[PDB]
Design a protein around this ligand. Structure first.
Ligand SMILES: COc1ccc(C)cc1S(=O)(=O)NCC1(c2ccccc2)CCN(C(=O)NCc2ccc(C)cc2)CC1
Ligand SMILES: COc1ccc(C)cc1S(=O)(=O)NCC1(c2ccccc2)CCN(C(=O)NCc2ccc(C)cc2)CC1
Lengths: 546, 546
C-alpha cells in the first residue's frame, strides 16, 4: 500500500525542463543534433557535470568546463560554435524560464492532505551565479509544501547511483513498495523500479497524473480549485514590540519587500489573515500580521480609554518607529478597516497606501452624537448591548467554542440576527448551545481562536466599541481633509452589517479611490472568499503600492 | 537652572530651511522681492498656511490654495508668473534638499546625555505628497533622539499662539525658567521669552551653539567625535522562529531594505552589534541581529552534536525559510564569521553577499587532524582547555561579571594571555577577582551580558568548540569549491588570536574578495572601533550587496 510520493524537480515539478534547452539551442542555432547534450554529459560519472551534481564544484566553476566540453564536441563533429556562444547566457535564460508545474504541485499537495509523506529528490547544483536568487525563490516556494527536499549537491550522491535511493528510503522511513517515484528520465527511474517502488515516467503532466490517481486511488485530475496556502502558527516568525510601558504588540512576519501591515477586526486574530499571509509574501511583500491591541499575544490593558482611535493609531505609529519603518501599506478589515482609514487621515506620511475590506470610510457628523447615529441603524443595536462594561464579556466568555462557532459563519449559514439584541438580552439567546461547524472553518481553527481568547478574554476587544464620543471628537478634527494617498475599498455583497451601499459616498472624500467587490461574500471576507481577496489585494498592491 | 532644551525643526535641526526656498525661487526666477513669501503668508492666522499648519487640511489640499495666493500677489505687484510655475515642484525640491543639521543634533544628544529632557517643537503639515517618504524618513531619524516631538498639525495649535507654549511646558513637566528654546524665527521665539524661557535666535549654527554652551554650562562645540547610536534592548522589535521541535532562534529586527543577518562570536549576543544595528538600518537595510544557537533567548540544547557547523548552517537556512527570505547578506564576527564562510560555501543561493570581521577563511587540511592543527598554534591552547565538557563551563559560570570584564578589553588593556591556559589550569587563574571596567563598555552593558548568560550558561556556547572532527570532515567536502559570490574580509590589526596574517591566502579561494582593515583594533571589533566598522560595512553593502 502506497503512503509516500517522490517527485523530481526538472521536467516534473518545474517546467520547461532546463534539460531541453540544450536541444532547443542546437535547433535554434542550426548546430549538429545532440552536440550540446553530448558536451553536457562528457565523461559520464567522472565528468564535470557529475562533479557539479555531487556538489564537488559550484555552477560558476562548471560553466568554463562545459564550454571546453562544447569545443571538443564541435571539433570531433567538424563544426563551428557561433561568435557570442555563452553557456552562462543559455543557462541564465533556461533557469529563469523554468516555473512551477502547478497541476503537479496541486497533486503533491492533495496526496500530502490525504496523509502521504511527500518528497522532492533532485539532481541539482550549488548556484553562485549573480542571478541565483530566482532559483532560490522557486526552491523556497516549492519546498514548503513537502516533508523532504533531497538535493544531490547536498548529499554528495546522484541519480542513477543506487545509494541515493537507499538514502531516500531511509529518510522516508518507508519500505520501497509504499513509494511512488515520478521522474522525466527513464534511466533515473530504473533503480527505484529495481528496488520495487511504484514508478511513473513523466512526459506530459496529464498522463502522469492519470497514472498517479490510478495507482494511489485518489482523485488528482479535474479536482476543484483548492484553497490558498494557510499558516501553521508554530511555523511562523513571531515578533514583539513594546510601544509603551504596559503595552506590547505581537505580529507574525513573512516575506521580503514593501512592508504590508494587516489589521484584523472584532473579535479576531492575526490568524484571520492565514490565507493572505503566504500569498502576499509570495507576491513580493513583507507581511506584518498584527494581533491588534486587546487580542492574542498583544497586551490587553483594562481601561476603556486605552482603546480610543487616537491612542490605537498613535501606538501603530510607535510600532513602525520601533521597527525602523518609515511607512507601511495598511490593510484593515472590520474595526481594523476603521483604524486604517484614520491612519491615512492623521498619519499620511506613514501610510504608503491604504485598503479596507468591508469597512467604509464615513466622515463624523458634527451635528449628531455617535449614540444618535448608532440608534438610526437597526443593524447596529448589538453595539448598544456592547456598551455596559462586563455584560457582553460575560456572554462572549461563557463558552468560547460556542462564541466562535456562532460568529464565524458564511452568508448561507447564519445563526445570528444582530437586530433587537438588547430586547432579546444577548447575542446568542436564540442561538444553539452546540452550533454546527461552518464550511469556512475546521474544528482545529476554531480551537486556535478559543486558545487565543483564554489569555485576555473580551474586555480589551469590547473596549474598541466604548470610545464613541472620544472617537467622534477626534474624527471631527479631520473634517476639512481628503484622503489623497493610494486607497482601495473592497465591498462584500452579503455583509449585512457593513453593507456595500454604506460605501457609496466615499468618492467625495477619497477622489482617486479604487474598488474591489466580492459577490456571495459575508462579513468574514478573508476566510469566506480567500482566493478572491488575494487576487484583489495583489493586483492593487502591484499597481498602486509597488 | 536649565534641564530642558527645545529645538525647532526648520532652520534649526534641519537645513537648508524650507522657508528660504520662496526667496531663492524669487531671485532665481527674477520675480519681485518677497512676492512668494507674501503669497505663502496670505490671510495670516486665517489664511491657507495656518489651516495647513493646524492640521485642518493636508499639503496636497494646500498646494492649489498657495498657487491661487501667488496669482493674487503677482496681480497686485503688476507682474507675471512663469509658464511652468509649480508650487509642487518648488516644495518637492525644497523638502528633498533639507537634511539634518548634524552639529545641532550632536548638541541635543549631548544635552540629553547630561540628563536634559529634549523636545522638538515644530510648525509642520500632514504630508500626503507622492514623495512624502523622504520627510517621513527624516522625521524618523531625528525623533528617536528626543524625549518629545510636538507637531503643530497633530496638536491643532501653531507658533506664535501662546497655547502651544503652555502645551509645551505641560508635556515637559517643567517651569519656563528650566527651558532653552532654539528657533530661527524671532516672532516664534517671543512668546517663549515672554513666559521667561531662555531663548536663542538661530542664524548660523556655530553662534547658536556658543550661546547654548554658555547658557547650559556644557561643552557642545569642538567636542570629540561621539560613538554611533547604540540599542536599548527594551526598545527593539524581538523576533522568534522555531527551526526544529526543541530549537528556537531569537533575533532583533530593525529597518527596511535588503535583509542583513548579523552573526556574533564567542561568548557574545545580538547586543554585540548594538552600534551597527541603528547605522545599517539608517543606511537602508533590514537588520536581523541573531542570538546564535546556545545564546541569549535562543535555545541551548545540551548535546555537543547540536553545535557542529553542518547543523548550525542547516538551521540558519530553515530560519530564512520560515521568515520567507530567499536570501540574506550574512555578516559574521569570530565564530559567526566562520559560520558565514560555510553559508557561502554550502548555500550560495541563499547568501546575497558575505562578510567576516577578524575570522579568515582557511580551507580544511585533509592531511592533518584538526587536533594536530590546533596544537600547531600556541595561541590556540585555550581551545584544548575548552574541550572537556564541564571544565571551562565551571570557570566561566562562577562569576559572570568577572568573566565579561576579563574578556571584553581593548588592545591596550589586556588581562588575558590565551597561551599556556591548560598548563595554568584556567583562563582567569592569573586574572584579578574584580577587574577594572574597559573603556569599550559601561557597567550596565556588562550587566546585560551577565543577565543573558544566566539563562543557559556556557555549555551551548562552548559546544561550538567541541565539533572539530565533525566540522573538518564536513569542510573537506567543499575542498574543490571557490567562493565566487560578493565577499568582504575585515582584518583587525591587534587581534592576537585572529591575526591579519592568517587571512593572507584567502585570494586563492575567494578571487574577487574585497578587504577592509582596522588599525589599533583588538578582538572585539564592533565595540572597539564601531565608527570604522560602520563605515567599512555600509560602503561595501552599497557597492556589492545593493
Ligand atoms: C462610522 O463610525 C460608525 C458609524 C456608525 C456606527 C453604528 C458605528 C460606528 S463606529 O465607528 O462606532 N463602529 C465601527 C464599525 C463601523 C460601522 C459602520 C461604518 C463603519 C464602521 C466597524 C466594526 N463593526 C462591528 O461591530 N464589527 C463586528 C461584527 C461582528 C459580526 C458581524 C456579522 C459583523 C460585524 C461595526 C461598527
Ligand atoms: C580554521 O578552523 C580552525 C583552525 C585552527 C584552529 C585552532 C581552530 C579552528 S576552528 O574552526 O576549530 N575555530 C574557529 C576559530 C578560528 C580560528 C582560526 C581561524 C579561523 C577560525 C574562530 C573563533 N575563535 C575563538 O576561539 N574565538 C573566541 C575568542 C575569545 C577571546 C579572544 C581574545 C579571541 C577569541 C578561534 C577559533
Amino acid at each position: 500500500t502506497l503512503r509516500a510520493a517522490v517527485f523530481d524537480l526538472d521536467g516534473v515539478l518545474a517546467l520547461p525542463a532546463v534539460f531541453g534547452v540544450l536541444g532547443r539551442t542546437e535547433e535554434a542555432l542550426a548546430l549538429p543534433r545532440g552536440l550540446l547534450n553530448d558536451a553536457f554529459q562528457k565523461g559520464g560519472p567522472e565528468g564535470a557535470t557529475t562533479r557539479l551534481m555531487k556538489g564537488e564544484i559550484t555552477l560558476s566553476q562548471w560553466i568554463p568546463l562545459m564550454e571546453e566540453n562544447c569545443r571538443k564536441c564541435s571539433e570531433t563533429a567538424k563544426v563551428c560554435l557561433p561568435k557570442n556562444f555563452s553557456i552562462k547566457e543559455i543557462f541564465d535564460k533556461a533557469i529563469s524560464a523554468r516555473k512551477i508545474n502547478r497541476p503537479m504541485l496541486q497533486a503533491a499537495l492533495m496526496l500530502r492532505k490525504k496523509g502521504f509523506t511527500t518528497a522532492i529528490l533532485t539532481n541539482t547544483w550549488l548556484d553562485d551565479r549573480a542571478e541565483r536568487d530566482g532559483l532560490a525563490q522557486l526552491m523556497c516556494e516549492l519546498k514548503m509544501h513537502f516533508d523532504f527536499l533531497i538535493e544531490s549537491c547536498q548529499v554528495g550522491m546522484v541519480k542513477p547511483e543506487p545509494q541515493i535511493y537507499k538514502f531516500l528510503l531511509d529518510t522516508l522511513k518507508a519500505s520501497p513498495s509504499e513509494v511512488v517515484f515520478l521522474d522525466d528520465i527513464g534511466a533515473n527511474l530504473k533503480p527505484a523500479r529495481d528496488l520495487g517502488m511504484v514508478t511513473i515516467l513523466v512526459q506530459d503532466t496529464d498522463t502522469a497524473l492519470k497514472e498517479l490517481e490510478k495507482v494511489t486511488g485518489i482523485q488528482l485530475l479535474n479536482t476543484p480549485a483548492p484553497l490558498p496556502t494557510s499558516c501553521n502558527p508554530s511555523d511562523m516568525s513571531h515578533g514583539y514590540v513594546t510601544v509603551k510601558p504596559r503595552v506590547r504588540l505581537h505580529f507574525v512576519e513573512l516575506g521580503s519587500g514593501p512592508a504590508v501591515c494587516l489589521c484584523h477586526g472584532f473579535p479576531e486574530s492575526w490568524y484571520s489573515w492565514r490565507y493572505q499571509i503566504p500569498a502576499l509574501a509570495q507576491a513580493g511583500y513583507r507581511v506584518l500580521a498584527m494581533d491588534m491591541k486587546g487580542y492574542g499575544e498583544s497586551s490587553a490593558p483594562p481601561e476603556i480609554e486605552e482603546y480610543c482611535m487616537e491612542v490605537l493609531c498613535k501606538e501603530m505609529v510607535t510600532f513602525l518607529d520601533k521597527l525602523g519603518l518609515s511607512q507601511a501599506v495598511f490593510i484593515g478589515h472590520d474595526w481594523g478597516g476603521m483604524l486604517v482609514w484614520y491612519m491615512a487621515l492623521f498619519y499620511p506620511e506613514r501610510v504608503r497606501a491604504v485598503a479596507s475590506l468591508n469597512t467604509p470610510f464615513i466622515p463624523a457628523n458634527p451635528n449628531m452624537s455617535p449614540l444618535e447615529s448608532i440608534k438610526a441603524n437597526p443593524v447596529f443595536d448589538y453595539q448598544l448591548y456592547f456598551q455596559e462594561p462586563g455584560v457582553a464579556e460575560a456572554e462572549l466568555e461563557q463558552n468560547l467554542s460556542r462564541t466562535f462557532k456562532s460568529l464565524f459563519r458564511a452568508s448561507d449559514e447564519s445563526v445570528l440576527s444582530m437586530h433587537k439584541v438588547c430586547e432579546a438580552g444577548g447575542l446568542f439567546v436564540n442561538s444553539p448551545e452546540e452550533p454546527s461547524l461552518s464550511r469556512m472553518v475546521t474544528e482545529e481553527e476554531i480551537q486556535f481562536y478559543v486558545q487565543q481568547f483564554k489569555k485576555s478574554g473580551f474586555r480589551g476587544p469590547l473596549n474598541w466599541y466604548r470610545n464613541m464620543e472620544r472617537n467622534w471628537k477626534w474624527a471631527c478634527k479631520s473634517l476639512g481633509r481628503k484622503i489623497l494617498i493610494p486607497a482601495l475599498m473592497v465591498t462584500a455583497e452579503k455583509d449585512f452589517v457593513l453593507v456595500p451601499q454604506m460605501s457609496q459616498h466615499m468618492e467625495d472624500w477619497i477622489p482617486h479611490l479604487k474598488r474591489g467587490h466580492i459577490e456571495d461574500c459575508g462579513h468574514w471576507t478573508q476566510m469566506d472568499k480567500p482566493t478572491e481577496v488575494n487576487q484583489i489585494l495583489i493586483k492593487w498592491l502591484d499597481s498602486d503600492a509597488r
